[PDB]
Design a protein around this ligand. Structure first.
Ligand SMILES: NC(=O)c1ccc[n+]([C@@H]2O[C@H](COP(=O)([O-])OP(=O)(O)OC[C@H]3O[C@@H](n4cnc5c(N)ncnc54)[C@H](O)[C@@H]3O)[C@@H](O)[C@H]2O)c1
Ligand SMILES: NC(=O)c1ccc[n+]([C@@H]2O[C@H](COP(=O)([O-])OP(=O)(O)OC[C@H]3O[C@@H](n4cnc5c(N)ncnc54)[C@H](O)[C@@H]3O)[C@@H](O)[C@H]2O)c1
Ligand SMILES: NC(=O)c1ccc[n+]([C@@H]2O[C@H](COP(=O)([O-])OP(=O)(O)OC[C@H]3O[C@@H](n4cnc5c(N)ncnc54)[C@H](O)[C@@H]3O)[C@@H](O)[C@H]2O)c1
Ligand SMILES: NC(=O)c1ccc[n+]([C@@H]2O[C@H](COP(=O)([O-])OP(=O)(O)OC[C@H]3O[C@@H](n4cnc5c(N)ncnc54)[C@H](O)[C@@H]3O)[C@@H](O)[C@H]2O)c1
Lengths: 233, 251, 239, 241
């Protein structure tokens, strides 16, 4: 069970973000859905509303500080508080081994996957501090825990997400903010293992909700693999 | 709904983390077999479950004894017909010195309960779960399974070993419907720990200072992690060592 | 022992980079020293030459693709090939917890510590491919293995170095290119004395201890060692 | 590059242990070769002596406290001190997945691989303390860092080696004793002498005994004084995934 009232999900227009927004709402939480994709983001808000939940869509490019600042202000204006943040927007666009990549790809992946998470947390934390605490979950990857051949920039970016996650967890541990990362392997989304199958968006959402749950109060600074056994070998 | 399995086995269920997790399973609607050397504490866990409206039974078992563990798993099927979830949580922590100051009796005792006990339990749980087409196992490791434990080197070795058993079994049985995970608690406030720091408050001050959160963990927090690892929507989660540690391993 | 002929050290004007440049040269390797700090970089080369070794300084801002390209080609122009690369240039400039940092600090740290390593590797690898091999060592940090309070951007950047390292190690494992990261804790350099008992050993590390770890990772008998993050930390990560 | 005078190598009669004993001796260190196998052990000593080095053989079952104590005493008896210890004796004997294993296998693997390392360190440490320091390397495995299907007891045992290593490293850090683990993947030992195991390494081959020996010597080297409590994978990329 979740007793906080408001969650923010970035990248909530599709895939893991949409599923996790829906899961928060089904648990009784008011959800701000943030994304570049306004069509999909309103699609997520409408699915929540048709199921009996509360949700608003706010368009935001997480690479832009002013828009992320406005997004967290929008959370406060819409619902008065922010208890949970799922910083999940990310991209994966590489086509080759490290020597065959280009600087445009590097810049784009790092901007969304690292700067986006950093900016989001940078603006979420003061609002959570004002309320006496909160819980943040960042989407890393099994590529944040080991090699990702032909996705070396992506792996660098998801490693970096774990570094931000652990550092913020320690910095704000005594201030009521928990910070964790979920580390999916291959998940059946549009961006698309010892168990012999790929994972499902509902399985990532369930892990995010565990990390945000009332009885996860002692869980902070971890990178939770949801990976069908991939990192165990 | 979150756990659709019918039957859980908790070893070390007479006290502490095991007692609380047995209660958490029962509160979720699961019938619980409580296994322990401590008959009094074990029947006490069962009584608390029953008074709360759940179902449980106690089966005495020394997890270091192969014949007793085999009979314990047989007793689960006799009592409730199957075994969906197993929490292999019995363990001891008895060292008093640095590595060169420990003794072979301590080594043998710690390794027997903490490693052989987990191995025996899995050895007899897995065939039952194979026959059912699936099951989930959670083993109690520790933050000492993930890093040094000064003045507890044998304990650390034993909890590292639990993670090795966990990951190996997770890969071996992944395609047979069995998931195997480990929970890695830091210091948890059990009834025994509380008695200890009531007599010596420095133990509470020191233990809280070991964790970035500035407190020790709660038995209900370990229980909730175990139930997550057993939950229906944790079907893609296997072979992990989940720290529940107030940030301790993030440092 | 090291059978390769040519090493490149970025951030070689000072500290860990200077000591590792000197160590390569002591092992008989010709060294290209690269840094923004020309006076320090020429100082490293002067010290190597004064001890009987061979080295040259090439000024390079590792955040700039064209400068890194010219630097790597300059290695081949000076000495004919490039067998070893120590991608060690880095900065540490944060002054607050995550929510107190600023975007300029983020951009600067990520540019040197992540883009610099990525650019260096992407232009070192083609030469090593043509050679049938090489050894790359990237300077990560214990901050790439765990939290670094009040240095969250730095920790993100050094985590990213490990991701680059492991990914390239797998990509090129069958092409003879080993890629590893050394992970120092606090080392007694100007980066440390600028910032002004956390280490179980009771002291901070020495630059020659990092250099020795780099040289092990580059050594002929390290041919089965790739994709690792080697902590040189007085025990810090073992807790 | 190694200023210590005396190294002890357990499991020194064959394979990684023989190779590391030879490497120590080639670096000018005096070597105590320790093993159950007296014939292979003296063979290691003979190879060292043929190359101009200094070694002796001492028989020891590392599962027996009295023999391990006598082994360390024997190091001091032969050479006066003990600077380096490579606790490398180990076995790998399982035949099936976890539920198909047996208790005799469990007991044997844990006794050599865990108790043997524990006993060795327990008796090495006081001698090193009295000298003002020393360096210990324990042989773990990639199976100490992840799953080993059909070798679950072995994986448990090598995980345990890493736990002993890290704990002792922190306990004795300020007393000058460094404690590290080397973590080999598949190594071409005379027992190994197939193509399937080679292919599961990203490098595409199995490792050489000389590559493990060189990692042990780095961990014992004079300029490894800030390296302690680590598990060093020598694995052709296996653990980088
Ligand atoms: N197999 C997988 O899908 C997989 C595996 C590992 C990690 N991940 C990570 O999971 C997270 C979600 O992945 P997904 O599979 O649901 O991807 P997805 O393709 O379904 O969409 C992710 C969302 O992020 C949005 N987005 C992208 N850039 C944005 C930006 N600058 N600002 C705001 N929104 C932006 C997109 O519009 C999209 O709605 C990502 O961070 C991804 O890297 C995914
Ligand atoms: N701070 C903590 O409490 C902490 C921290 C890390 C790990 N752990 C681990 O949590 C698990 C339970 O911890 P706890 O604090 O609740 O301990 P506890 O002493 O309060 O309960 C442990 C139970 O295990 C039983 N037991 C011991 N040996 C047994 C045997 N051979 N056969 C059957 N039962 C046996 C005991 O009778 C006891 O009821 C253990 O594995 C422990 O190592 C605990
Ligand atoms: N000293 C420590 O405690 C410590 C700890 C962990 C990691 N590190 C890392 O070790 C490496 C070396 O640091 P150091 O301790 O020797 O400090 P240092 O500042 O003395 O050396 C860093 C070198 O990198 C150069 N440099 C910076 N930006 C550059 C750029 N864009 N292009 C080219 N050169 C550039 C600098 O001029 C300098 O000479 C860095 O990557 C650092 O992040 C240091
Ligand atoms: N593929 C590999 O070879 C591999 C991989 C990972 C780890 N390891 C580990 O490397 C170490 C050496 O392995 P190896 O491949 O050289 O094996 P090996 O069988 O060739 O040599 C092992 C030596 O240990 C000795 N030994 C066994 N039990 C002993 C005991 N109780 N007391 C004293 N000596 C004993 C043996 O007599 C033998 O000489 C072991 O710890 C092993 O577990 C080996």
């Amino acid at each position: 069970l979740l007793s906080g009232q408001v969650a923010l999900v970035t990248g909530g227009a599709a895939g893991i973000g949409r599923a996790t927004a829906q899961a928060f709402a089904a648990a009784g939480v008011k959800v701000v859905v943030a994304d570049l994709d306004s069509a999909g983001g309103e699609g997520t808000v409408e699915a929540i509303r048709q199921a009996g939940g509360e949700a608003v869509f706010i368009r935001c490019d997480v690479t832009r500080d002013a828009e992320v600042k406005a997004l967290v202000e929008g959370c406060a204006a819409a619902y008065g508080r922010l208890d949970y943040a799922f910083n999940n927007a990310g991209i994966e666009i590489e086509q080759g081994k490290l020597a065959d990549g280009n600087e445009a790809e590097f810049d784009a992946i790092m901007a969304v996957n690292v700067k986006g998470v950093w900016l989001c947390m940078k603006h979420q934390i003061p609002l959570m501090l004002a309320q006496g605490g909160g819980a943040i979950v960042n989407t890393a990857s099994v590529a944040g825990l080991g090699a990702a051949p032909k996705m070396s920039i992506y792996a660098a970016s998801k490693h970096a997400v774990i570094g931000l996650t652990k550092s913020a967890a320690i910095e704000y541990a005594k201030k009521g903010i928990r910070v964790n990362a979920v580390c999916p392997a291959v998940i059946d989304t549009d961006m698309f293992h010892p168990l012999g199958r790929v994972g499902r968006v509902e399985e990532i959402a369930a892990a995010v909700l565990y990390l945000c749950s009332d009885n996860a109060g002692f869980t902070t600074g971890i990178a939770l693999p949801v990976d069908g056994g991939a990192t165990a070998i």
